[PDB]
Amino acid sequence: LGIVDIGALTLESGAVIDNVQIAVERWGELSPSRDNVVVVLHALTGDSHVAGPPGWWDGVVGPGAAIDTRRWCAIATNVLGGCRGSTGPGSLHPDGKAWGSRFPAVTVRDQVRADLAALNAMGIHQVAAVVGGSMGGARALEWVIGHPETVRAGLILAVGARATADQIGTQSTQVAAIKADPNWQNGDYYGTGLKPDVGLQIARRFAHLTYRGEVELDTRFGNAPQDDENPLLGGRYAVESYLEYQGRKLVDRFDAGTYVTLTDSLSSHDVGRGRGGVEAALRSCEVPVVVGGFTSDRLYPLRLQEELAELMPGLNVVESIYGHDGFLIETEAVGKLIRQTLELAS
Amino acid sequence: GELGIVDIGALTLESGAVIDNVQIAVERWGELSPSRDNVVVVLHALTGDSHVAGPGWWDGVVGPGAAIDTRRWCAIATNVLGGCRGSTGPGSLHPDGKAWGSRFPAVTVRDQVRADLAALNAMGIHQVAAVVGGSMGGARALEWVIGHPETVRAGLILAVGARATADQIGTQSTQVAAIKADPNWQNGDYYGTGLKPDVGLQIARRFAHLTYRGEVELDTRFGNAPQDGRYAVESYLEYQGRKLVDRFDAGTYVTLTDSLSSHDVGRGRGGVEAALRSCEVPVVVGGFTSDRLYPLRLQEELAELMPGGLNVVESIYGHDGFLIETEAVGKLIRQTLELAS
Ligand SMILES: [Ca+2]
Ligand SMILES: [Ca+2]
Ligand SMILES: [Ca+2]
Ligand SMILES: [Ca+2]
Ligand code: NA
Ligand code: NA
């Protein structure tokens, strides 16, 4: 885990963040010409820990993996706004306190420019490929549309061209649940000894449902009770105790302020903004791209990836029971799409 | 057009708990026939009540000339056991003078059916022509036809499944958790304290409303547009939450959401397949193509397993299609009433 200083960054809004730092992790050696970089773009609650025994995409990064680190140099940042090394709301403001409520709104476009600045500070100027799903797919899409000169190919998984009403609906309500927590303290809870654990748990429980496949959830849990508990006497259902576990697991590893900042960056995703709309922006693409979507995805439904593949100058439909999380679980299917993307960059 | 309160006395619930003096609120439209053979029971959904027709929550299908033509039929609607608009529920007074609150027992759909039947029986009604309902009302209709077939001549079951699913229990239990996390919940004993869990109930309803709508139509209506700083869809959801808080009780929301989570027509009957195959009542089953909460596969299962084809309603409105698609629902009601005649 290294930290790259990129200095002051001017955001799309005109706001400036002083002294931005971007955390970077690398697997594989950089080639003499620096022509073998594959940028792996993490999703909402991910980070730079892509691979290693555990890395959120370990199945696709390593020796002999889809991103074969004997040949490619896999680089992952922690996104701008994150909480695992990069500048975010918990980072220190110039006044010595956490940014907190003063942290500006960040867009996916800002996040791409911060990643590119980190690469440039490392002496890397063109990457072979960008790859990502979900928020990482939004980052990959904005990279190929906004900075095609810097990337030879892209894999865009499980995302749409802009945020949808249903996505903004659940995202805004997840944020509202966090802000309703008595410990949110307007986002300035850092250093107080209190954190909005309850609101973040509620947000994550609803988010987890959006990530899963409806049928698979019912196959896994049905209406089964939690073992030895009777719901009519105050007991819980199996899916209910599982959701409680998911919410608590996130609270134990993730910052509420970062969740809000990054969720907001999902809600403002729109490749068409300032470019004449989604269709005009997608038609402008000059980077070879592979697009994949998952049949059971309820958060970024397949129609969104059909649109990407139709408007960008065929869609890879992955039959999967795992919903949106298919982009993390379907190692072999995703691996084939990665290998196809890397062939386009070679 | 007056709200009547029917005393049904003591009710022993499926859990074994007993409520000493249950009251069920009732509204009626249309004259009861001399033989009492023209009763159509309308079963409301989670946040509905007995006010079906004025407007009422299903006003388009009840009235003179409507799908339930009150010139011929006597439409009767109760407020469900656990409710907050006249029937016994957590905000009702316990024998000790305080609200039931945290002492209110768990209520199942089967309990709700038995309370409705007891209210009808107290009014001298012993067999109904039809039961009709969608969503929680469809669960009530299904348990009525399976558990008490001798009391009903036909049923319309809309936008529900044979048991609660994992996704339904997931969102239901998390909506309840959001209410219970509100500082004003006070263990459910907030009645009379001057404080209510308005924020938690708003959060629950915002998430629930998304489950009731169609993904595509939400994007058609709002996209990522701003409001007039909120996004348009965000302002819409905030409005939906405030609207519910203004008219509905959090404790009842919890009690009735729990009743949805415990829905299972197979319990104590050998499982869903055995229970549905036992149906002796002609039923019409309807589902809506864009429903994200009770997806169409659940109604396919109902139709496949019940002795009785599925009526598939092409609708953009999601689960709320059962409330919005007046013409398609009306056709299904009229089919049901022909089976009862
Ligand atoms: Ca690996
Ligand atoms: Ca419970
Ligand atoms: Ca009417
Ligand atoms: Ca906002
Ligand atoms: Na700089
Ligand atoms: Na009685």
Author numbering:
A (entry chain B): 17 to 69, 77 to 336, 340 to 372
B (entry chain A): 15 to 68, 77 to 250, 258 to 337, 340 to 372
Which lines from the publication concern this structure?
The three solved MetX structures include residues 15–70, 77–372 from MhMetX, 10–379 from MaMetX, and 7–372 from MtMetX. The catalytic domain comprises residues 15–181, 297–372 of MhMetX, residues 17–183, 304–379 of MaMetX and residues 17–181, 311–372 of MtMetX. For MtHTA and MhHTA, Ser157, Asp320, and His350 comprise the active site; MaHTA’s triad is comprised of Ser160, Asp327, His357. Thr61/61/64, Arg227/227/230, Tyr234/234/237, and Asp351/351/358 for MhMetX, MtMetX, and MaMetX respectively all surround the active site to help facilitate the binding of acetyl-CoA and homoserine. The extended loop between β3 and β4 show differences in secondary structure content, length, and orientation. Both MhMetX and HiHTA contain a short sequence with helical propensity adjacent to β4. Temperature factors of the equivalent rings in MhMetX is B = 19 Å2, while both MtMetX and MaMetX are B = 21 Å2, values very similar to the HiHTA structure with B = 16 Å2. All three solved MetX have a similar, conserved hydrophobic patch running along the inside of the active site tunnel. All three solved structures crystallized as dimers at the expected interface and orientation that corresponds to predicted physiologically active assembly.
MetX (previously mis-annotated as MetA in the reference genome of M. tuberculosis) is an l-homoserine O-acetyltransferase, commonly also referred to as a homoserine transacetylase (HTA) and is a crucial enzyme in the biosynthesis of methionine and threonine. Here we report the structures of three homologous MetX enzymes from Mycobacterium tuberculosis (MtMetX), Mycolicibacterium abscessus (MaMetX), and Mycolicibacterium hassiacum (MhMetX) and compare them to previously solved structures of HTAs in order to begin development of selective inhibitors of MtMetX via a structure-based approach. Two copies of each monomer exist in the asymmetric unit of all three structures. MetX can be divided into two distinct structural domains, the catalytic domain, and the lid domain. The organization of the catalytic domains’ fold marks MetX as members of the α/β-hydrolase super-family.
